[PDB]
Coordinates of C-alpha atoms in Angstrom, one line a residue:
Chain A
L3 CA -121.2 -52.9 37.7
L4 CA -119.2 -49.7 37.1
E5 CA -121.1 -48.1 40.0
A6 CA -120.6 -51.3 42.2
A7 CA -116.8 -50.7 42.4
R8 CA -116.6 -46.8 43.4
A9 CA -118.2 -47.0 46.1
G10 CA -117.6 -50.5 46.0
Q11 CA -120.1 -53.6 46.3
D12 CA -118.0 -56.6 46.5
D13 CA -121.1 -58.8 47.0
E14 CA -122.8 -57.0 44.1
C15 CA -119.8 -58.0 41.9
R16 CA -120.5 -61.6 42.4
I17 CA -124.2 -60.9 41.9
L18 CA -124.0 -58.8 38.9
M19 CA -121.9 -61.4 37.2
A20 CA -123.0 -58.7 33.0
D21 CA -120.0 -57.4 31.0
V22 CA -117.0 -57.7 33.2
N23 CA -115.2 -55.1 31.1
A24 CA -117.9 -52.4 30.6
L25 CA -116.6 -49.2 29.7
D26 CA -117.2 -45.5 30.5
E27 CA -116.4 -42.2 28.9
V28 CA -112.8 -42.3 30.2
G29 CA -112.5 -46.0 29.2
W30 CA -112.4 -47.2 32.9
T31 CA -113.6 -50.7 33.5
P32 CA -114.7 -52.0 36.9
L33 CA -111.3 -53.0 37.6
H34 CA -109.9 -49.6 37.1
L35 CA -112.3 -48.2 39.7
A36 CA -111.5 -50.9 42.1
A37 CA -107.9 -50.4 41.8
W38 CA -108.1 -47.2 44.1
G39 CA -108.1 -49.2 47.4
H40 CA -110.9 -51.9 47.0
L41 CA -108.9 -55.0 47.4
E42 CA -111.8 -57.4 47.8
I43 CA -113.6 -56.1 44.7
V44 CA -110.5 -56.3 42.6
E45 CA -110.2 -59.8 43.6
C46 CA -113.8 -60.5 42.7
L47 CA -113.5 -59.1 39.2
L48 CA -110.3 -60.8 38.4
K49 CA -111.8 -64.2 39.3
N50 CA -114.7 -63.4 37.0
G51 CA -112.4 -62.8 34.1
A52 CA -111.8 -59.1 34.1
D53 CA -109.4 -58.1 31.4
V54 CA -106.4 -57.3 33.7
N55 CA -104.5 -55.2 31.1
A56 CA -107.4 -53.1 30.0
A57 CA -106.0 -49.6 29.1
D58 CA -108.0 -46.3 29.7
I59 CA -108.2 -43.3 27.4
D60 CA -104.7 -42.3 28.5
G61 CA -103.1 -45.8 28.3
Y62 CA -103.3 -46.6 32.0
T63 CA -103.9 -50.3 33.1
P64 CA -105.2 -51.1 36.4
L65 CA -101.6 -51.8 37.6
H66 CA -100.5 -48.2 36.7
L67 CA -103.5 -46.8 38.8
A68 CA -102.7 -49.0 41.6
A69 CA -98.9 -47.8 41.5
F70 CA -100.2 -44.2 41.4
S71 CA -102.5 -44.6 44.4
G72 CA -99.9 -46.7 46.5
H73 CA -101.8 -49.8 47.0
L74 CA -99.3 -52.7 47.6
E75 CA -101.7 -55.5 47.8
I76 CA -103.6 -54.6 44.9
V77 CA -100.4 -54.3 42.8
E78 CA -99.6 -57.9 44.2
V79 CA -103.1 -59.3 43.1
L80 CA -103.0 -57.8 39.7
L81 CA -99.8 -59.3 39.0
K82 CA -100.7 -62.6 40.3
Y83 CA -103.6 -62.6 37.7
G84 CA -101.3 -61.7 35.0
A85 CA -100.9 -58.0 34.8
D86 CA -98.4 -56.9 32.3
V87 CA -95.6 -55.6 34.6
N88 CA -94.1 -53.5 31.8
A89 CA -97.1 -52.0 30.3
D90 CA -96.6 -48.6 28.9
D91 CA -99.0 -45.6 28.9
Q92 CA -99.1 -43.1 26.3
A93 CA -96.1 -41.2 27.8
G94 CA -94.2 -44.4 27.8
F95 CA -94.5 -44.9 31.6
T96 CA -94.6 -48.4 33.0
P97 CA -95.9 -49.0 36.4
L98 CA -92.2 -49.0 37.6
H99 CA -91.8 -45.3 36.2
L100 CA -94.9 -44.3 38.2
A101 CA -93.7 -45.9 41.3
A102 CA -90.3 -44.1 40.9
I103 CA -92.0 -40.7 40.2
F104 CA -94.4 -41.0 43.2
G105 CA -92.0 -42.5 45.7
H106 CA -93.4 -45.9 46.3
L107 CA -90.6 -48.1 47.5
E108 CA -92.3 -51.2 48.4
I109 CA -94.1 -51.2 45.1
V110 CA -90.8 -50.6 43.3
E111 CA -89.6 -53.9 44.8
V112 CA -92.6 -55.9 44.1
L113 CA -92.5 -54.7 40.6
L114 CA -88.7 -55.7 40.1
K115 CA -89.4 -59.1 41.8
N116 CA -92.1 -59.7 39.0
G117 CA -89.9 -58.9 36.2
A118 CA -90.2 -55.1 35.6
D119 CA -87.8 -53.9 33.3
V120 CA -85.4 -51.5 35.0
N121 CA -84.0 -50.3 31.8
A122 CA -87.4 -49.2 30.2
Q123 CA -87.5 -45.9 28.5
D124 CA -90.3 -43.6 28.2
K125 CA -91.1 -41.5 25.1
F126 CA -88.2 -39.1 26.0
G127 CA -85.6 -41.9 26.7
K128 CA -85.9 -41.8 30.5
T129 CA -85.7 -44.9 32.9
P130 CA -87.4 -45.3 36.1
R131 CA -84.2 -44.4 37.9
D132 CA -83.9 -41.2 35.9
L133 CA -87.5 -40.3 37.1
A134 CA -86.6 -41.2 40.7
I135 CA -83.6 -38.8 40.6
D136 CA -85.7 -36.2 39.0
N137 CA -88.2 -36.4 41.9
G138 CA -85.7 -36.5 44.6
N139 CA -86.4 -40.2 45.5
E140 CA -82.7 -41.4 46.3
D141 CA -83.6 -44.7 48.1
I142 CA -85.5 -45.8 44.8
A143 CA -82.8 -44.5 42.7
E144 CA -80.1 -46.6 44.6
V145 CA -82.4 -49.8 44.5
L146 CA -82.9 -49.2 40.7
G147 CA -79.3 -48.8 39.9
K148 CA -78.2 -52.0 42.0
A149 CA -80.9 -53.8 39.9
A150 CA -79.6 -52.6 36.6
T151 CA -76.1 -53.8 37.6
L152 CA -77.3 -57.2 38.5
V153 CA -78.9 -57.4 35.1
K154 CA -75.5 -56.6 33.5
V155 CA -73.7 -59.2 35.7
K156 CA -76.0 -62.0 34.8
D157 CA -75.9 -60.8 31.1
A158 CA -72.0 -61.0 31.2
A159 CA -72.2 -64.4 32.6
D160 CA -74.5 -65.4 29.8
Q161 CA -72.4 -64.0 27.2
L162 CA -69.3 -65.6 28.7
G163 CA -70.8 -69.0 29.4
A164 CA -69.3 -69.1 32.6
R165 CA -70.1 -67.9 36.3
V166 CA -69.3 -64.2 37.4
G167 CA -68.9 -63.1 41.0
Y168 CA -69.6 -59.6 42.2
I169 CA -69.5 -57.4 45.2
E170 CA -69.8 -53.7 45.7
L171 CA -68.8 -52.5 49.4
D172 CA -68.9 -49.2 51.1
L173 CA -65.4 -48.2 51.8
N174 CA -66.2 -46.3 54.9
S175 CA -68.9 -48.4 56.6
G176 CA -68.2 -51.8 55.1
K177 CA -71.9 -52.2 54.1
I178 CA -72.4 -54.7 51.3
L179 CA -74.2 -52.6 48.6
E180 CA -74.8 -55.2 46.1
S181 CA -73.3 -58.8 45.4
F182 CA -73.7 -61.9 43.2
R183 CA -72.1 -65.3 43.9
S184 CA -70.3 -63.5 46.6
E185 CA -69.7 -66.6 48.8
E186 CA -68.3 -68.8 45.9
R187 CA -64.6 -69.3 45.4
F188 CA -62.7 -68.2 42.4
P189 CA -59.1 -68.2 41.4
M190 CA -57.4 -65.0 42.6
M191 CA -54.8 -64.9 40.0
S192 CA -52.6 -61.9 40.2
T193 CA -55.2 -60.0 42.5
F194 CA -53.4 -61.8 45.4
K195 CA -50.6 -59.3 45.0
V196 CA -52.5 -56.6 46.8
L197 CA -52.6 -59.0 49.8
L198 CA -48.9 -59.7 49.4
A199 CA -48.2 -56.1 49.6
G200 CA -50.3 -55.6 52.7
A201 CA -48.2 -58.3 54.3
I202 CA -45.0 -56.7 53.5
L203 CA -46.1 -53.3 54.6
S204 CA -47.2 -55.1 57.9
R205 CA -43.9 -56.4 58.4
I206 CA -42.2 -52.8 57.6
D207 CA -44.6 -51.4 60.3
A208 CA -43.6 -54.1 62.9
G209 CA -39.7 -53.4 62.1
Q210 CA -39.4 -56.9 60.6
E211 CA -38.7 -55.5 57.1
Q212 CA -37.1 -52.3 55.5
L213 CA -38.4 -50.8 52.3
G214 CA -34.8 -50.1 51.3
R215 CA -33.5 -53.8 51.8
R216 CA -31.8 -54.9 48.6
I217 CA -32.5 -58.3 47.4
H218 CA -30.2 -60.0 44.8
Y219 CA -31.5 -62.7 42.5
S220 CA -30.5 -64.7 39.7
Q221 CA -31.6 -65.8 36.1
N222 CA -32.9 -69.1 37.7
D223 CA -35.3 -66.9 39.7
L224 CA -36.8 -65.3 36.8
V225 CA -40.3 -66.7 35.8
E226 CA -42.5 -65.5 32.9
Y227 CA -43.8 -62.0 32.8
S228 CA -41.1 -60.3 34.8
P229 CA -40.8 -57.0 33.0
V230 CA -39.2 -55.2 35.7
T231 CA -37.1 -57.8 37.4
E232 CA -35.5 -59.1 34.3
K233 CA -34.0 -55.7 33.7
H234 CA -32.3 -55.5 37.3
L235 CA -30.5 -59.1 37.2
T236 CA -27.2 -57.4 37.9
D237 CA -28.0 -55.0 40.6
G238 CA -30.8 -56.5 42.3
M239 CA -33.9 -54.5 43.6
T240 CA -35.0 -53.1 47.0
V241 CA -38.3 -54.3 48.8
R242 CA -39.8 -51.0 47.9
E243 CA -39.1 -51.6 44.0
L244 CA -40.1 -55.2 44.2
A245 CA -43.5 -54.3 45.7
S246 CA -44.0 -51.5 43.2
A247 CA -43.2 -53.8 40.4
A248 CA -45.6 -56.5 41.8
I249 CA -48.4 -54.3 42.2
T250 CA -48.3 -52.0 39.3
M251 CA -46.8 -54.1 36.6
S252 CA -47.9 -57.6 38.1
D253 CA -44.2 -58.6 37.8
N254 CA -44.2 -62.3 38.7
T255 CA -40.6 -62.8 39.8
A256 CA -41.1 -59.6 42.1
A257 CA -44.1 -61.3 43.8
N258 CA -42.2 -64.5 44.2
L259 CA -39.2 -62.9 45.9
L260 CA -41.4 -60.9 48.2
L261 CA -43.4 -64.3 49.0
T262 CA -40.1 -65.7 50.0
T263 CA -39.4 -63.1 52.5
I264 CA -42.8 -64.0 54.3
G265 CA -42.6 -67.8 54.2
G266 CA -44.2 -68.5 51.0
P267 CA -47.8 -69.0 50.1
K268 CA -48.2 -70.6 53.6
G269 CA -46.9 -67.3 55.1
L270 CA -49.3 -65.3 53.3
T271 CA -52.2 -67.6 54.1
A272 CA -51.0 -67.3 57.9
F273 CA -51.2 -63.5 57.6
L274 CA -54.5 -63.7 56.1
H275 CA -55.8 -66.0 58.9
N276 CA -54.4 -63.9 61.6
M277 CA -56.3 -60.7 60.4
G278 CA -59.5 -62.8 60.4
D279 CA -59.8 -63.8 56.7
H280 CA -60.2 -67.8 57.1
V281 CA -61.3 -68.2 53.5
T282 CA -58.6 -66.6 51.2
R283 CA -55.7 -68.9 50.7
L284 CA -52.5 -68.9 48.5
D285 CA -50.8 -72.3 48.0
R286 CA -48.8 -71.9 44.8
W287 CA -46.1 -69.4 43.3
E288 CA -46.3 -67.5 40.1
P289 CA -47.3 -68.6 37.4
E290 CA -48.6 -71.9 38.7
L291 CA -51.3 -70.2 40.8
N292 CA -53.2 -69.2 37.7
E293 CA -54.1 -72.7 36.6
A294 CA -57.9 -72.3 37.7
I295 CA -58.5 -76.1 37.8
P296 CA -62.3 -76.8 38.4
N297 CA -63.0 -77.7 41.9
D298 CA -59.5 -76.7 43.1
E299 CA -59.5 -74.7 46.3
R300 CA -56.1 -73.7 45.9
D301 CA -55.2 -70.0 45.4
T302 CA -58.8 -68.9 45.8
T303 CA -60.9 -66.2 47.5
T304 CA -64.6 -65.4 47.5
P305 CA -65.7 -61.8 46.2
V306 CA -66.7 -61.1 49.8
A307 CA -63.6 -62.3 51.5
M308 CA -61.4 -60.4 49.2
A309 CA -63.4 -57.2 49.3
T310 CA -63.5 -57.3 53.1
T311 CA -59.9 -57.9 53.5
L312 CA -59.1 -55.1 51.1
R313 CA -61.1 -52.9 53.0
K314 CA -59.4 -53.7 56.1
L315 CA -55.9 -53.1 54.5
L316 CA -56.9 -49.8 53.1
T317 CA -58.9 -48.3 55.9
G318 CA -58.6 -50.3 58.9
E319 CA -56.1 -50.5 61.7
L320 CA -54.1 -53.5 60.3
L321 CA -51.6 -51.1 58.7
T322 CA -50.2 -47.6 59.9
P323 CA -51.7 -44.6 58.1
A324 CA -48.6 -44.2 56.0
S325 CA -48.7 -47.7 54.9
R326 CA -52.3 -47.8 54.1
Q327 CA -51.6 -44.7 52.0
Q328 CA -48.8 -46.4 50.4
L329 CA -50.8 -49.4 49.3
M330 CA -53.5 -47.1 47.8
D331 CA -50.8 -45.1 46.0
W332 CA -49.3 -48.2 44.4
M333 CA -52.7 -49.6 43.4
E334 CA -53.6 -46.1 42.0
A335 CA -50.4 -46.4 39.8
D336 CA -51.4 -49.8 38.2
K337 CA -50.1 -50.0 34.7
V338 CA -51.8 -53.1 33.4
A339 CA -55.4 -52.9 34.0
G340 CA -56.3 -50.5 31.1
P341 CA -58.9 -52.5 29.5
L342 CA -61.0 -53.2 32.5
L343 CA -62.7 -50.8 34.9
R344 CA -60.3 -47.8 33.9
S345 CA -61.6 -48.2 30.2
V346 CA -64.9 -46.7 31.2
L347 CA -63.8 -44.6 34.3
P348 CA -65.1 -41.0 33.8
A349 CA -63.0 -37.8 34.0
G350 CA -62.0 -36.7 37.6
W351 CA -62.7 -40.2 39.1
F352 CA -60.2 -42.0 41.3
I353 CA -59.3 -45.6 41.0
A354 CA -56.8 -47.9 42.7
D355 CA -57.0 -51.3 41.4
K356 CA -55.3 -54.8 40.6
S357 CA -56.2 -57.1 37.9
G358 CA -55.6 -60.8 37.2
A359 CA -55.9 -63.3 34.3
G360 CA -55.3 -66.9 34.3
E361 CA -56.1 -70.1 32.4
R362 CA -59.6 -71.5 31.5
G363 CA -60.9 -68.1 31.0
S364 CA -60.2 -66.6 34.4
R365 CA -60.3 -63.0 34.7
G366 CA -60.8 -60.6 37.6
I367 CA -60.2 -57.2 39.3
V368 CA -60.2 -55.7 42.7
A369 CA -60.5 -51.9 43.0
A370 CA -61.3 -49.0 45.3
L371 CA -62.8 -46.2 43.3
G372 CA -65.1 -43.1 43.4
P373 CA -66.0 -39.7 41.9
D374 CA -64.2 -36.5 42.5
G375 CA -60.8 -37.8 43.2
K376 CA -61.5 -39.9 46.1
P377 CA -62.3 -43.7 46.7
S378 CA -65.4 -44.5 48.4
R379 CA -66.3 -48.0 47.3
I380 CA -64.6 -51.2 46.8
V381 CA -65.6 -53.3 43.9
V382 CA -64.5 -57.0 43.2
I383 CA -65.2 -59.0 40.0
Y384 CA -64.2 -62.5 39.1
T385 CA -65.0 -64.9 36.5
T386 CA -63.6 -68.5 35.5
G387 CA -64.6 -71.2 33.1
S388 CA -65.3 -69.2 29.9
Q389 CA -64.2 -70.3 26.4
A390 CA -64.3 -66.5 25.3
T391 CA -61.2 -64.4 24.1
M392 CA -59.4 -62.0 26.4
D393 CA -60.9 -59.0 24.5
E394 CA -64.3 -60.6 25.3
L395 CA -63.7 -61.1 28.9
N396 CA -62.4 -57.6 29.3
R397 CA -65.3 -56.1 27.6
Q398 CA -67.7 -57.8 29.9
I399 CA -65.8 -56.7 33.0
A400 CA -65.7 -53.1 31.6
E401 CA -69.5 -53.2 30.9
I402 CA -70.2 -54.2 34.6
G403 CA -68.0 -51.4 35.6
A404 CA -69.9 -49.0 33.2
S405 CA -73.2 -50.1 34.9
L406 CA -72.0 -49.7 38.5
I407 CA -70.5 -46.2 37.5
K408 CA -73.9 -45.2 35.8
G409 CA -75.9 -46.2 38.8
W410 CA -73.5 -44.8 41.4
Chain B
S8 CA -112.1 -31.1 58.1
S9 CA -110.9 -27.6 57.3
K10 CA -112.2 -24.1 58.2
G11 CA -112.2 -23.1 54.5
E12 CA -114.7 -25.8 53.6
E13 CA -117.5 -23.8 55.6
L14 CA -117.2 -21.2 52.9
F15 CA -118.5 -23.7 50.2
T16 CA -121.7 -25.0 51.9
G17 CA -124.0 -23.1 49.6
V18 CA -124.0 -21.2 46.4
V19 CA -120.9 -18.9 45.9
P20 CA -120.6 -16.0 43.4
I21 CA -117.7 -16.2 40.9
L22 CA -115.7 -14.0 38.9
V23 CA -113.1 -14.9 36.3
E24 CA -110.5 -12.3 34.6
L25 CA -108.1 -13.3 32.2
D26 CA -105.5 -11.4 30.2
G27 CA -103.8 -13.3 27.5
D28 CA -101.1 -13.0 24.7
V29 CA -100.9 -15.9 22.2
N30 CA -98.4 -15.5 19.4
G31 CA -98.5 -11.8 20.0
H32 CA -102.4 -11.8 19.8
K33 CA -103.4 -9.8 22.9
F34 CA -106.9 -10.6 24.4
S35 CA -109.0 -10.2 27.6
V36 CA -111.9 -12.4 28.9
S37 CA -114.3 -11.6 31.8
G38 CA -116.6 -14.4 33.4
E39 CA -119.2 -14.5 36.0
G40 CA -121.7 -17.1 37.5
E41 CA -121.7 -19.2 40.5
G42 CA -120.5 -22.6 42.0
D43 CA -122.2 -25.2 44.2
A44 CA -119.6 -27.4 45.6
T45 CA -122.3 -29.6 47.4
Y46 CA -123.0 -30.9 43.7
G47 CA -119.4 -30.2 42.3
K48 CA -121.4 -27.7 39.8
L49 CA -120.1 -24.6 38.1
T50 CA -122.3 -22.4 35.8
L51 CA -120.3 -19.5 34.1
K52 CA -120.6 -17.2 31.1
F53 CA -117.5 -15.7 29.7
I54 CA -117.2 -12.8 27.2
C55 CA -114.1 -11.9 25.2
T56 CA -113.9 -8.1 25.8
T57 CA -111.5 -7.4 23.1
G58 CA -113.4 -8.6 20.0
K59 CA -113.1 -12.2 18.8
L60 CA -111.1 -14.6 20.7
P61 CA -108.0 -15.5 18.9
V62 CA -108.0 -19.1 20.0
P63 CA -111.0 -21.6 20.4
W64 CA -113.0 -21.3 23.5
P65 CA -112.6 -24.8 24.6
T66 CA -108.8 -24.2 24.9
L67 CA -109.3 -21.9 27.8
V68 CA -111.8 -24.0 29.9
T69 CA -109.1 -25.5 32.4
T70 CA -107.6 -22.2 32.7
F71 CA -111.0 -20.4 33.6
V72 CA -111.6 -23.0 40.3
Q73 CA -111.1 -26.6 41.6
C74 CA -112.4 -25.5 45.2
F75 CA -115.9 -26.1 43.7
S76 CA -115.1 -30.0 43.2
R77 CA -117.3 -32.2 45.3
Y78 CA -115.3 -34.1 47.8
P79 CA -117.2 -36.8 49.4
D80 CA -117.4 -36.8 53.4
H81 CA -114.8 -39.5 53.6
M82 CA -112.4 -37.5 51.7
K83 CA -112.7 -34.0 53.2
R84 CA -109.3 -34.2 54.8
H85 CA -107.9 -34.5 51.2
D86 CA -109.4 -31.3 49.9
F87 CA -106.4 -29.0 49.5
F88 CA -108.3 -26.3 47.4
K89 CA -110.9 -25.3 50.0
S90 CA -108.5 -25.5 53.0
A91 CA -106.4 -22.6 51.4
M92 CA -109.6 -20.4 51.5
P93 CA -110.3 -17.5 52.0
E94 CA -106.7 -16.5 51.4
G95 CA -106.5 -18.7 48.5
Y96 CA -103.8 -20.2 46.1
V97 CA -101.6 -19.7 43.2
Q98 CA -102.3 -22.0 40.4
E99 CA -99.6 -22.3 37.6
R100 CA -99.6 -24.4 34.6
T101 CA -97.9 -25.3 31.4
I102 CA -100.2 -26.8 28.8
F103 CA -98.6 -28.3 25.7
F104 CA -100.6 -28.7 22.7
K105 CA -99.4 -31.9 20.8
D106 CA -97.6 -30.8 17.5
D107 CA -98.4 -27.2 18.3
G108 CA -97.6 -24.4 20.8
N109 CA -98.0 -24.0 24.4
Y110 CA -99.9 -22.0 27.2
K111 CA -98.2 -20.9 30.4
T112 CA -100.6 -19.6 32.9
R113 CA -100.4 -18.1 36.4
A114 CA -103.5 -17.5 38.3
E115 CA -104.7 -16.5 41.9
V116 CA -107.8 -18.1 43.3
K117 CA -109.2 -16.4 46.4
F118 CA -112.2 -14.7 48.0
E119 CA -112.7 -11.1 47.5
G120 CA -115.4 -10.3 49.7
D121 CA -118.2 -13.0 49.4
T122 CA -117.1 -13.8 45.7
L123 CA -114.5 -16.3 44.7
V124 CA -112.3 -14.8 42.1
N125 CA -109.9 -16.4 39.5
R126 CA -107.6 -13.9 38.0
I127 CA -105.2 -15.3 35.3
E128 CA -102.4 -14.2 33.2
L129 CA -101.8 -16.4 30.1
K130 CA -98.9 -16.3 27.6
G131 CA -99.1 -18.6 24.7
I132 CA -95.9 -19.1 22.1
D133 CA -94.9 -21.1 19.1
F134 CA -98.6 -21.8 17.7
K135 CA -98.7 -22.8 14.1
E136 CA -100.6 -20.1 12.1
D137 CA -103.0 -22.8 10.5
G138 CA -102.8 -25.3 13.4
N139 CA -105.8 -26.3 15.3
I140 CA -105.7 -23.5 17.8
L141 CA -104.9 -20.4 15.6
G142 CA -106.7 -21.9 12.6
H143 CA -109.9 -22.5 14.7
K144 CA -110.3 -26.2 13.9
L145 CA -111.6 -27.4 17.2
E146 CA -115.3 -28.4 17.7
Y147 CA -117.4 -26.4 20.1
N148 CA -117.7 -29.3 22.8
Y149 CA -115.8 -30.7 25.7
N150 CA -115.0 -34.2 27.0
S151 CA -114.8 -35.9 30.4
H152 CA -111.4 -36.4 31.9
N153 CA -109.5 -37.7 34.9
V154 CA -107.4 -35.3 36.9
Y155 CA -104.4 -36.7 38.9
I156 CA -103.7 -34.9 42.4
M157 CA -100.5 -35.6 44.6
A158 CA -99.1 -33.7 47.4
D159 CA -95.8 -31.6 47.1
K160 CA -94.7 -31.4 50.7
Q161 CA -91.8 -29.3 50.0
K162 CA -93.9 -26.5 48.6
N163 CA -96.7 -26.9 51.0
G164 CA -99.0 -27.5 48.1
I165 CA -100.1 -30.1 45.2
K166 CA -99.1 -31.1 42.0
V167 CA -101.6 -31.9 39.2
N168 CA -101.4 -33.7 35.9
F169 CA -103.7 -34.7 33.3
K170 CA -104.5 -34.7 29.5
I171 CA -107.1 -32.7 27.9
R172 CA -108.8 -34.1 24.5
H173 CA -110.3 -31.4 22.2
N174 CA -112.2 -32.8 19.3
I175 CA -111.1 -31.5 15.8
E176 CA -113.7 -30.8 13.2
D177 CA -112.3 -33.5 11.0
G178 CA -112.7 -36.4 13.5
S179 CA -109.4 -36.2 14.9
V180 CA -108.4 -35.1 18.5
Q181 CA -105.9 -32.4 19.7
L182 CA -104.2 -33.3 23.0
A183 CA -103.4 -30.8 25.5
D184 CA -101.0 -32.1 28.2
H185 CA -101.5 -30.3 31.6
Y186 CA -98.7 -29.8 34.2
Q187 CA -100.1 -27.9 37.2
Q188 CA -98.9 -26.7 40.6
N189 CA -100.8 -25.1 43.2
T190 CA -99.5 -23.2 46.4
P191 CA -101.3 -21.5 49.3
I192 CA -101.2 -17.7 49.4
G193 CA -101.7 -17.6 53.2
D194 CA -99.6 -18.9 56.1
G195 CA -102.4 -20.9 57.7
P196 CA -102.3 -24.6 57.5
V197 CA -103.6 -26.4 54.6
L198 CA -104.6 -30.0 53.9
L199 CA -102.2 -32.0 51.8
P200 CA -103.9 -35.0 50.2
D201 CA -103.1 -38.5 49.5
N202 CA -102.9 -39.4 45.9
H203 CA -106.2 -39.3 44.2
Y204 CA -108.3 -38.1 41.2
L205 CA -111.1 -35.9 40.1
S206 CA -113.6 -36.9 37.4
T207 CA -114.9 -34.0 35.3
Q208 CA -117.4 -33.1 32.6
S209 CA -118.4 -30.1 30.9
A210 CA -121.1 -28.8 28.6
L211 CA -120.6 -25.7 26.3
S212 CA -123.4 -23.6 24.8
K213 CA -124.4 -20.2 23.7
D214 CA -126.5 -17.3 25.1
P215 CA -129.2 -16.6 22.3
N216 CA -129.2 -13.0 23.7
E217 CA -125.5 -12.4 23.2
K218 CA -123.8 -11.0 20.0
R219 CA -120.4 -10.8 21.6
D220 CA -118.0 -13.6 21.3
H221 CA -118.5 -15.8 24.4
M222 CA -119.1 -19.3 26.1
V223 CA -121.7 -20.6 28.6
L224 CA -120.2 -23.3 30.5
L225 CA -121.9 -26.0 32.9
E226 CA -119.4 -28.3 34.7
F227 CA -119.6 -31.0 37.3
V228 CA -116.4 -32.4 39.2
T229 CA -116.3 -35.0 41.8
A230 CA -113.1 -36.2 43.7
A231 CA -112.6 -40.0 44.2
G232 CA -109.9 -42.5 44.7
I233 CA -109.6 -42.7 48.4
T234 CA -111.5 -45.3 50.5
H235 CA -112.3 -45.5 54.2

């Protein structure tokens, strides 16, 4: 039966059935021999009860050998018959490690679909992505990075007991690199202020507004969490100062004053609709817009809508070059998002961001970020519904960030 | 499938020359015999020309000509080793002995006239003075192994990986993890294979006429792992 699969004899397999798991000097069963491209023989052996997880003298299962030799259909049937997707050889390599070393992308994807552990470590602590990088397999490294980040997004939602929405977009091309719940609505919270600032900058570009125009306001305009505007009651503030305060300090009165200039939440929604975002909507003012009532469509976006709109503001033709640089510069100077993506951002990286927090466990962030001092991707993360504490929500968002940075 | 393969249709004489230095113990070995790739068969005798070999003979088997492997007809297009002939190939290895030192080897395998010659330099470091190697605790025998071969397109060559298992006199096994690269010496085109394996077996013996320190080797190797 060992010779009947070399040199294959698929009709002999059924005839000889005999020890289905007969061994040779290297611990190969007939299944190990057939794994090198004899699909029909593999199937016969498995049907007849071959030990799908038999390990040879080096620790290789048939799935390991099929991963090395590159036979997609044999990988698939072994898994169908219960092959251990995460079996480790004597070096600690799983089949996913082997597929990553040898450059077999289609096999990487089947293994991931069948529950391969993207974070499995060999005897020297190395994951499949580490080995893909070492062997120059950049497309596999990218796939493995996204998969590890989705593991973390789903872990965050488990820990928080709440839905988590995520998208990572290429800043230059607009390509969606990875996403989760990206078409579901979430409360924007103060992340809407980036869209407000974009609308203000658009009006400046058109000659409908002036950065230096001074706005006076009174005690009655002050709402909670207005750290800059509360200090300028006597002298007022210019449009520039208000936009700075709204973006970088999340100043709520500043945002409300700027909303009035554009016709309120309805005016911001009209600006969004006119640039092609028919999903994002603002309906209420600060602070009521943070209520996060279940099933309430008011004051919501989706991860893909927000990321797409933010990309158009920062890199599109919607704003003049000077204005799109001003938006980025204000977001770069954000002062109140420390515990989120900034808390895990490595030395030399660039980030321009805006965070939000609301009722019912709502938390989120929008960001343009990248290594070497230049942004190259947009990340949007939202969650709502959790009973967890603020520190817990912050840590889960930070850990998603650490994963997408590690896998960059 | 390659012009080089025509050089291996019959019995071919072989010469092996090795210069070694393990933990500062310098030694040399000369070998001679013949190979018959039609059967995947090598027959060789080695002599230590510097006295007693300071490491066990079995530890040098893999260092002492994979062009003599039998490639079945349907796999001839995957035989890198013969395709590089007669100009030959460089074969480089690191061999890590578990819980012990390592060998680093560089060899050239090529025809010199009608003879296939393997000329090797070997450096060994970090061996334990009473480990299995310098303490001569390995049995005089040899196991069967699987040798894994993959193309390295960027180097116009191959990468090879496998683990050798050396029986120890107390019933344990000394592992020797082999990392290998082969690159052609010549400029002509070579065959770069799909991933496959070789199956090996080796028998060690002694020449009853020989008083010098020596090893007689009979080895069979067949390639497999590619279908039609």
